[PDB]
Design a protein around this ligand. Sequence first.
Ligand SMILES: [Ca+2]
Ligand SMILES: [Ca+2]
Ligand SMILES: [Zn+2]
Ligand SMILES: [Zn+2]
Length: 247
Amino acid sequence: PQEAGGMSELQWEQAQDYLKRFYLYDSETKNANSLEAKLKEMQKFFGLPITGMLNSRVIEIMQKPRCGVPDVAEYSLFPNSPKWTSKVVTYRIVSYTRDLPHITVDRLVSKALNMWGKEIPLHFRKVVWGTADIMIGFARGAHGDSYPFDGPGNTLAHAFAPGTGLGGDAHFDEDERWTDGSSLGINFLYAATHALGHSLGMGHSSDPNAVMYPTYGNGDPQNFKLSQDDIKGIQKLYGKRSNSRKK
Ligand SMILES: [Ca+2]
Ligand SMILES: [Ca+2]
Ligand SMILES: [Zn+2]
Ligand SMILES: [Zn+2]
């Protein structure tokens, strides 16, 4: 439809900002010409082939929601290996959103987290007494951590890397819409694979059928399943695999 033709400067400029936050709001990449190189890495990060452009898929994704985890990091004392080295992983829900009953949130977090575990020799464990590694809560950036709330729209959910006992948690922007049967806003199952995937130190992928595919296409999946590219992606680190194997 060529909607970009009738867009204003404000829209094109907004794009600069929407992506600026996707990799931390750092003035180090603040220059007119850098736009070209800086979109170059965005376009490949997503995978979409139109490089050097800002109008077709590239604007669509700026406006569509996706994830709230920056795609960069810079710290020392990093834990053993980027993904969960531990022999086991544990996970517990902190609170639940009114859109969904606790039972539902709980079984979705697990039905995705478990899929991840089912593609690798890692092992997973149920929680019935004590705290866990990955806490799953609903909250706004002003709950008690860095990164602003954003509100609805851009920035879907922040999550943390498997580091320390406190780090590794997954969060859900409570402002965002969260539901399964209704199949209206963001599917918990689908986002859960993504949010929980970051809890395992997994990164985004470029394949059009990826499970952490950042080019979200809206809608809710009926059954949902893991992707080939993510299964091989993770097995390169853990060596052996379980070839998904699910119902
Ligand atoms: Ca949001
Ligand atoms: Ca944790
Ligand atoms: Zn993400
Ligand atoms: Zn937080």
